[PDB]
Structures are given as C-alpha cells and as structure tokens.
Write an enzyme that holds these catalytic residues in place. Structure first.
Site, PDB file in Angstrom:
ATOM      1  N   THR A 122       0.783  -1.197   0.137  1.00  0.00           N
ATOM      2  CA  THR A 122       0.029   0.099   0.134  1.00  0.00           C
ATOM      3  C   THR A 122       0.988   1.165   0.041  1.00  0.00           C
ATOM      4  O   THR A 122       1.684   1.436   0.740  1.00  0.00           O
ATOM      5  CB  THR A 122      -0.875  -0.124   1.070  1.00  0.00           C
ATOM      6  OG1 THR A 122      -1.995  -1.320   1.107  1.00  0.00           O
ATOM      7  CG2 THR A 122      -1.716   1.280   1.454  1.00  0.00           C
ATOM      8  N   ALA A 169      -2.687  -3.637  -1.770  1.00  0.00           N
ATOM      9  CA  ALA A 169      -4.086  -3.768  -1.537  1.00  0.00           C
ATOM     10  C   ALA A 169      -5.073  -3.222  -2.372  1.00  0.00           C
ATOM     11  O   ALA A 169      -4.771  -1.860  -2.427  1.00  0.00           O
ATOM     12  CB  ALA A 169      -4.341  -3.806   0.019  1.00  0.00           C
ATOM     13  N   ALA A 181      -6.249 -13.672   7.104  1.00  0.00           N
ATOM     14  CA  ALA A 181      -5.402 -13.462   8.515  1.00  0.00           C
ATOM     15  C   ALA A 181      -6.522 -13.616   9.503  1.00  0.00           C
ATOM     16  O   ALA A 181      -7.823 -13.588   9.407  1.00  0.00           O
ATOM     17  CB  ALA A 181      -4.682 -11.895   8.720  1.00  0.00           C
ATOM     18  N   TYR A 241      -9.657 -11.888   8.959  1.00  0.00           N
ATOM     19  CA  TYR A 241     -10.068 -11.464   7.625  1.00  0.00           C
ATOM     20  C   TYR A 241     -10.302 -13.001   6.927  1.00  0.00           C
ATOM     21  O   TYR A 241      -9.162 -13.599   6.597  1.00  0.00           O
ATOM     22  CB  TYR A 241      -8.667 -11.001   7.166  1.00  0.00           C
ATOM     23  CG  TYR A 241      -8.342  -9.537   7.616  1.00  0.00           C
ATOM     24  CD1 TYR A 241      -7.949  -9.215   8.847  1.00  0.00           C
ATOM     25  CD2 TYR A 241      -8.444  -8.377   6.841  1.00  0.00           C
ATOM     26  CE1 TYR A 241      -7.567  -8.206   9.204  1.00  0.00           C
ATOM     27  CE2 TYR A 241      -8.227  -7.125   7.317  1.00  0.00           C
ATOM     28  CZ  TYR A 241      -7.744  -6.985   8.557  1.00  0.00           C
ATOM     29  OH  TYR A 241      -7.398  -5.679   9.029  1.00  0.00           O
ATOM     30  N   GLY A 272       9.321  -6.804   0.744  1.00  0.00           N
ATOM     31  CA  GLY A 272       8.517  -5.719   0.567  1.00  0.00           C
ATOM     32  C   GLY A 272       9.364  -4.287   0.420  1.00  0.00           C
ATOM     33  O   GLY A 272       9.487  -3.559  -0.390  1.00  0.00           O
TER      34      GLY A 272
END
Ligand SMILES: Cc1cc2nc3c(=O)[nH]c(=O)nc-3n(C[C@H](O)[C@H](O)[C@H](O)COP(=O)(O)O)c2cc1C
Ligand SMILES: [Cl-]
Ligand SMILES: [Cl-]
Ligand SMILES: [Cl-]
Ligand SMILES: [Cl-]
Ligand SMILES: [Cl-]
Ligand SMILES: [Cl-]
Length: 308
Positions: A25, A56, A140, A143, A267
C-alpha cells in the site's frame, strides 16, 4: 536446490526469478480510489521482480475506504489499471492484484456473505479485464479466517469463508490465476490449530501459490522460543510456497536451500530498490527507504529512487 535467480513455474506462468515483490500500500491512487499514471511508472520500474503482488486493492465501494488506495469494483478503475499492467508486461514482468476486504476479529452479517462473494467474483473478473495476470486473496485472523459474523467451532467452519471466497475466485478466473497470502502473525504489525488446515484446504484447491508472512529470524532477545509455522505449512501445501518478512539475500537463499520455500517476496527493499534482483546479483549496496514517504501522495519517495 534452486537459486533465487532461477525461473519458477507457478499457475499458468513462469516467473523469471524467485525474488518477488510483496504487496505494498502506497497511497498514490486518487481520493476516490482510481489508479493514476504515476503507478504505471512505479510498477514498471520494479518489473524485474519475478512476480509483483500489487498493493491492496479494494473490492467494494464503501468498505475500503483508505483514500488514495485503489479499488477494482468499477469500470473506471479497470480502465485506469490498464496502463499499469501494460507497463509491467512491456517490461517483461508479471503482476497479480491483491484483493482486499477489511474484516473484524471476534463487521459483517451472515446475510451479506453472498454480496461479499459476488464482490470478489466481480473484482477477480475486473482484474482480468484490467490486464492483471491473476489475483491474491489476503487472509489473516481478522480476515476470512475467524471473521466476526456456521463460521465457528470446527476448523472447517473457521476457514469456511476463505474456502468459499477462494472457490468463487477460482470459478471465475481459474486456479492457475488464483493465489492467497496468509498472515498468521497479523496484518499491519491458536495459529497452528487453524493456519495449517487453511493451508491444506488451499492445497487441495490447487491454487497457484501461497504467500506466507513469517519472520525469517530464529532467536530474538526477550522472546521465548516457539517453533516456526513454515515447515509445517510446507508439509501440507503442495504448490509453490513463497515466504515473506525480513528476508535478506542470504536468509532468502538459505530458505530456498532448505527446501522450505520455492520463492521469497520482499516488501520494504523494493520501495527503495526498484532493481532489487540486480543488486542482489551484483552484491550492490541497497538504497535506504524513506519511511516518511511510504504513504504520501506524490512521486517523491515513490518513482524517484534510482536504478543502479
Ligand atoms: C508501506 C507498506 C505497505 C504494505 N502494504 C501491504 C498491503 O497492501 N498488503 C499486505 O498484505 N501487506 C502489506 N504490507 C506488508 C508487506 O507486504 C510485507 O509483508 C512486510 O513489509 C514484511 O516484508 P519485508 O520485511 O520484506 O518488508 C505493507 C508493508 C509496508 C511497509
Ligand atoms: Cl519451476
Ligand atoms: Cl493520473
Ligand atoms: Cl473493499
Ligand atoms: Cl462501473
Ligand atoms: Cl486455471
Ligand atoms: Cl528496508
């Protein structure tokens, strides 16, 4: 056996290496969640990654609502994504859209589950229309897994919403375009019991790859020892397994050498090092990322990190 620099078959694809870009993001979309031209340049700069997993990307109009983060529910969004996927493909790379739904831990009603499945179907189809190579579903503890709503008790029920979501996406775009990320230690920064069965279930659905976010490091001061989840995931999950979190070149190659991972996603390193694979290859120093500009709205701290 494999080198980080070796190609890898997954799904319908061959990634050119096993140094993948994790989802990030960045907040460079419009206030109303439309992608922008600057995002095309940013992704293209990083297309040497074997696979780019997008930031995302929201699946429903109200339920994002991070502004400056993109969605994919609308035709205007599909149109705005085309330049980004086209730029990645012109640079010879591959790009999956990470689809995001915000969940709550133990909010969504039983009677909204069909709308949710429909939103994912539609986002997955729109992703194809937008020229993405596939999609990654994020799960997750809040989620899709143990989401606050038949979705409780037996492990089967606790992972049910994830299974149903994954099956709908597969029915829409094919299992060879459908991936998942599991974040057992949380999303932004009990487990064994549920994430190992989640992974067996996904393996049986024969998804293209599984991403799992689990600290590279073994031995932290002030932390008592717990065994890693990854070797247990590797036993029940047959397709390619991609590990993430704090990997360096050396610990990444070690994970490939051990057999536990087929590829590794990075990342933060891809924020400041668009040509990460080549730096790794040449053993070049890394450019430090500037945390201040991770989520600002302009090209600074976005497309202005230089290539070697
Ligand atoms: C700026 C930033 C944005 C991130 N955005 C997402 C995201 O959109 N989706 C997601 O699943 N994880 C996201 N993460 C988590 C990363 O994908 C990754 O798992 C984490 O940064 C650890 O890997 P690394 O040590 O290689 O950076 C984000 C991390 C950062 C630092
Ligand atoms: Cl392969
Ligand atoms: Cl624009
Ligand atoms: Cl959403
Ligand atoms: Cl529309
Ligand atoms: Cl398929
Ligand atoms: Cl970093």
């Amino acid at each position: 056996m494999p080198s980080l620099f070796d190609p890898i078959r997954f799904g319908a694809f061959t990634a050119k290496n096993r140094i993948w870009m994790a989802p990030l993001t960045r907040g460079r979309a419009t206030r109303d969640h439309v992608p922008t031209e600057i995002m095309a340049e940013y992704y293209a700069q990083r297309a040497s990654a074997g696979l780019i997993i997008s930031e995302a990307t929201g699946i429903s109009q109200e339920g994002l609502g991070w502004p400056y983060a993109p969605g994919i529910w609308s035709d205007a969004q599909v149109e705005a994504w085309l330049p980004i996927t086209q730029a990645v493909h012109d640079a010879g790379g591959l790009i999956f859209a990470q689809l995001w739904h915000m969940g709550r831990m133990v909010a969504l009603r039983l009677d909204e589950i069909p709308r949710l499945l429909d939103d994912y179907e539609k986002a997955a189809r729109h992703a194809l229309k937008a020229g993405f190579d596939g999609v990654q579903i994020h799960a997750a503890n809040g989620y899709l897994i143990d989401e606050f709503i038949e979705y409780g008790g037996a492990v089967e029920n606790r992972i049910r919403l994830l299974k149903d979501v994954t099956e709908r996406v597969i029915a829409t775009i094919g299992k060879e375009r459908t991936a998942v990320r599991l974040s057992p230690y949380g999303v932004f920064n009990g487990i064994v019991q549920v994430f190992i069965p989640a992974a067996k279930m996904l393996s049986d659905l024969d998804i293209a790859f599984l991403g799992m976010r689990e600290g590279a490091v073994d031995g932290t001061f002030g932390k008592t020892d717990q065994p890693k989840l990854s070797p247990e995931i590797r036993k029940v999950f047959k397709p390619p397994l991609v590990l993430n979190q704090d990997y360096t070149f050396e610990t990444a190659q070690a994970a490939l050498d051990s057999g536990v991972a087929d590829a590794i996603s990075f990342g933060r390193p891809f924020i400041g090092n668009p040509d990460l694979p080549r730096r790794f290859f040449e053993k070049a120093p890394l450019t430090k990322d500037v945390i201040e500009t991770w989520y600002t709205q302009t090209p600074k701290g976005y497309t202005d990190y230089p290539l070697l």
